[PDB]
Amino acid sequence: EPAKEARVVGSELVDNYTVYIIQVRVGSHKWTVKHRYSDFHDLHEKLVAEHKIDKNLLPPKKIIGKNSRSLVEKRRKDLEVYLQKLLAYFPGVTPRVLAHFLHFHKYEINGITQALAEELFEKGEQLLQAGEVFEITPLQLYAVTEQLQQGKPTCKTDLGHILDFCCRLKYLKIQGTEGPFGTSNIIEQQLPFDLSIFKSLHQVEISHCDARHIYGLEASKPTLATLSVRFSTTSMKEVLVPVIPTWQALTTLDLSHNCISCIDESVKLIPKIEFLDLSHNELLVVDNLQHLYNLVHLDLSYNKLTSLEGLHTKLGNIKTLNLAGNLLESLSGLHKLYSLVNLDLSNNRIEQMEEVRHIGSLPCLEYLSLTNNPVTTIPDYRTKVLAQFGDRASEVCLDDEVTTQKELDTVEVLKAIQKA
């Protein structure tokens, strides 16, 4: 275990008092904390009362002399010696007062895990029984992972109480913070942690992490039905891959808001997917979705897709398809998606009204969005689109609007003109 070091590096004026600035170092991690003298005095009272500490160890409250800078410098030195004596006297388990004083509960492995076991003691059983989402940080998961790798005992201990909760939890959210955590040098995304301690997860939500550093999600592979990973991966296989067993329960997968640039071989591991969100990524083409026979809702919006040619050979019997925010000018290839019900093409580049011919004969379509495409500026746009749906013109919601009988009457005469 790393040695714990404290330095009183300086001081500054806050309101009408001086705070002493302490840099705390534990191995490679470093953080800063600020305390006025009376916070050290309040610390010292608890340490003498509860841990038998020498009552004269703290420098004096009364301070007198002619040079204020020199007095503050002597107090700075003396408070540094005080903290170093305390840290040498408690090399093992740190008193909770001293842990909170140096912010070990926020940045130090044993303080973090102590604070987590206090949280789970107070609230854990209630939220397990309520079926509520538990929120945790990569730094908490790191600290738990590190104690297990240090071989720290379970028998129960704080680490035992934590494991017994993680074993049972069904609903989990892991949220990383972008950049340095608090007053520390810690980058959460660089911290490795192991989810094997979770053994009954049904739903998981990961945001602002790095999936290179996440291990052990496969311990909940028999139970995991829903997975969201956002702002956290470069590929699907980086999340879905450690014979490899399939994600047998997984019906909802959200990998939106990432840098994913292809659909990869890890599709072989997600055969029962019903809902797939891949929006806000770097996709240029669709492929490898052929064998996801249960896929019903597909979101590919805000990628860099430019063609839909052959899409019926790449997809199963999809019902809802979102392609909004891509680079599409042509709808060629959609005309064989006979199962399709809901289609979103908003915010693309569609400009020829004649492209609607690729969707007008679709037998099940009930919803179409073309908002923010150039085609929407054409005169009589709505009635021109709906007329291409033939005798289904009454059955399609166009652009989130109720179709009027004035539209349908305008369509029936336009259709009689096209018939003649």
Curated annotation (Swiss-Prot):
<feature type="repeat" description="LRR 1">
    <location>
        <begin position="249"/>
        <end position="270"/>
    </location>
</feature>
<feature type="repeat" description="LRR 6">
    <location>
        <begin position="364"/>
        <end position="385"/>
    </location>
</feature>
<feature type="domain" description="PX">
    <location>
        <begin position="1"/>
        <end position="108"/>
    </location>
</feature>
<feature type="repeat" description="LRR 2">
    <location>
        <begin position="272"/>
        <end position="293"/>
    </location>
</feature>
<feature type="repeat" description="LRR 4">
    <location>
        <begin position="317"/>
        <end position="338"/>
    </location>
</feature>
<feature type="repeat" description="LRR 5">
    <location>
        <begin position="339"/>
        <end position="360"/>
    </location>
</feature>
<comment type="subunit">
    <text>Homooligomer. Interacts with GRB2. Interacts with PIK3R1; probably associates with the PI3-kinase complex. Interacts with IRS4. Found in a complex with ITGA5 and PAK1. Found in a complex with LIMK1 and PAK1. Interacts with ITGA5 (via cytoplasmic domain); this interaction is direct. Interacts with PAK1 (via kinase domain); this interaction is direct and is increased upon activation of PAK1. Interacts with LIMK1 (via PDZ and kinase domain); this interaction is direct. Interacts with LIMK2; this interaction depends on LIMK2 activity. Interacts with RAC1 (activated state).</text>
</comment>
<protein>
    <recommendedName>
        <fullName>Nischarin</fullName>
    </recommendedName>
</protein>
<feature type="region of interest" description="Necessary for binding to phosphoinositide-3-P; not sufficient for targeting to endosomes">
    <location>
        <begin position="1"/>
        <end position="120"/>
    </location>
</feature>
<comment type="function">
    <text>Acts either as the functional imidazoline-1 receptor (I1R) candidate or as a membrane-associated mediator of the I1R signaling. Binds numerous imidazoline ligands that induces initiation of cell-signaling cascades triggering to cell survival, growth and migration. Its activation by the agonist rilmenidine induces an increase in phosphorylation of mitogen-activated protein kinases MAPK1 and MAPK3 in rostral ventrolateral medulla (RVLM) neurons that exhibited rilmenidine-evoked hypotension.</text>
</comment>
<feature type="repeat" description="LRR 3">
    <location>
        <begin position="294"/>
        <end position="315"/>
    </location>
</feature>
